[PDB]
RNA sequence: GCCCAGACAGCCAGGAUGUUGGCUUAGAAGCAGCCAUCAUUUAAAGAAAGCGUAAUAGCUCACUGGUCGAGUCGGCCUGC
């Protein structure tokens, strides 16, 4: 009851096994990789197959585990706003896509649940810095 | 001196010292390493006694029971607690509110016939 | 104690502290006799910047994050702020409080599982 | 150049979040190489100057707070 851990990263909705990458990790902390897989690609079946949502999961107190699929928007749509598949190896030199001022506040506000910054103008000047360092132009 | 004597040494100070202190908490190493104590000494109740404004009870007058009611409604203290905070006039009626609230609290108290001050 | 030593002592003392003094002097001597020290104590430059103790963090214990939260709300300091001001036990929590304040600040931290002293 | 309105160095504790940045690569996730090097929380924290791993991990530095309270640091020349 006292033995508990906590840690988890982003995972592609549908992928899990084999061991690498998700194998020894979160596999020697108490929970096995045997199940947990179908307990992942069975709860996230109604959204976008290509949506790396970082579901938060604890570890155990007995043997089992837990699951809490949270919420992409964010990170996503940003890569799919200026060619996600075809990107510039050396960004800054050239461009890959474009975005208007409207679609600058759009992705904004829809992620404030992770960006604690007063005023909306401060919210705009955050994804404008994260705007691009891998393709796409400001204006 | 122990850090548990300096923090207080400050509180002891007044607008004069705090300013003389902050004016003695800068240039030596620039406003940079000074901002620490500057932004810490700034929040000195006074300018907020939002902009921590409290309420002091100079006197309740002849309408003690009247002043008690106002206190029992603002602080929410019991009958015995309220009267004990009005008779000896321990001042500090309530602190932490804003300028508007305190200005309002003072008003409500004055209406009851009590003399209030705002540090 | 030498008069000069007393003067330096008072300068090292504090408001509420000298208040416990002027109050003790007022209770011992009287509002008339203690009026001398009362009118001399207040001028701790004066207007009262506000109010004396301190809130040193002897140890955050195992609940570091817990102690952090309390400090973040008391000093208004952000996350990374209380971080160090709680880990290495820099002590310096917030300077510019009195009994009901410092005593409360201590209580707030103690609740978070932090050992705090009041000197 | 930094110096007694608590720094420059010690000691204590941080040194983070998206991100294992993109590309490349069997693998490289601060730290082979190729280009960028912005943003976040905010007292500080370079998408990171070194050691280290097969790749991670781990250990330091930069920067800041507390304490320490004083000479310290980079640099040029000359004698043996």
Curated annotation (Swiss-Prot), chain A:
| Post-translational modification N6-succinyllysine, affected residues | 70, 79
Among SMART domains, the record links this protein to: RL11
Per UniProt, what is one Pfam family of this protein?
Answer: Ribosomal_L11
Spans traversing the lipid bilayer: none
Q: Which domain of life is it from?
A: Bacteria
Instruction: Provide the GO MF annotations for this entry.
Output: large ribosomal subunit rRNA binding; rRNA binding; structural constituent of ribosome
Family from the record: Belongs to the universal ribosomal protein uL11 family.
Q: Which HAMAP family does its entry note?
A: Ribosomal_uL11 (MF_00736)
Q: How does it assemble?
A: Part of the ribosomal stalk of the 50S ribosomal subunit. Interacts with L10 and the large rRNA to form the base of the stalk. L10 forms an elongated spine to which 2 L12 dimers bind in a sequential fashion forming a pentameric L10(L12)2(L12)2 complex.
Q: What is the name attached to this protein's record?
A: Large ribosomal subunit protein uL11
Curated annotation (Swiss-Prot), chains B, C:
What other facts are recorded?
Answer: Ribosomal protein L8 appears to be an aggregate of ribosomal proteins L7/L12 and L10.
Cite the effect that the entry attributes to residue 64 to A.
Answer: EF-Tu-binding and EF-Tu-promoted GTP hydrolysis reduced
PANTHER family, per the entry = 39S RIBOSOMAL PROTEIN L12, LARGE RIBOSOMAL SUBUNIT PROTEIN BL12M
Q: What is this protein called?
A: Large ribosomal subunit protein bL12
The molecular function GO annotations come to: mRNA binding; protein homodimerization activity; ribosome binding; structural constituent of ribosome
Residue ranges of the region described as Required for recruitment of EF-Tu and EF-G, and for EF-Tu and EF-G-promoted GTP hydrolysis = 52-119
The answer on whether this UniProt entry bears the keyword tRNA processing reads no
């Amino acid at each position: 009851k006292k033995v508990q851990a906590y840690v988890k990263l982003q995972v592609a909705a549908g992928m899990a096994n084999p061991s690498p990458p998700v194998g020894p990790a979160l596999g020697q902390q108490g929970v096995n990789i045997m199940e947990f897989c179908k307990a992942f690609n069975a709860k996230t079946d109604s959204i976008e197959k290509g949506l790396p949502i970082p579901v938060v999961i604890t570890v155990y107190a007995d043997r089992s585990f837990t699951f809490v699929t949270k919420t992409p928007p964010a990170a996503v749509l940003l890569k799919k706003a200026a060619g996600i598949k075809s990107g510039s190896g050396k960004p800054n030199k050239d461009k890959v896509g474009k975005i208007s001022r409207a679609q600058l506040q759009e992705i904004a506000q829809t992620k404030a649940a992770d960006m604690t910054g007063a005023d909306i103008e401060a919210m705009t000047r955050s994804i404008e810095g994260t705007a691009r360092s891998m393709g796409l132009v400001v204006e | 001196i122990t850090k548990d004597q300096i923090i207080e040494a400050v509180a002891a100070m007044s607008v004069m010292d705090v300013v003389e202190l902050i004016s003695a908490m800068e240039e030596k190493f620039g406003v940079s390493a000074a901002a620490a104590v500057a932004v810490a000494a700034g929040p000195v109740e006074a300018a907020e006694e939002k902009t921590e404004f409290d309420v002091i009870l100079k006197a309740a007058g002849a309408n003690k029971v009247a002043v008690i009611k106002a206190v029992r409604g603002a602080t929410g203290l019991g009958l015995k607690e309220a009267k004990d905070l009005v008779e000896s006039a321990p001042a500090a009626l309530k602190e932490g509110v804003s300028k508007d609230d305190a200005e309002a609290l003072k008003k409500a108290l004055e209406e009851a016939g009590a003399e209030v001050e705002v540090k």
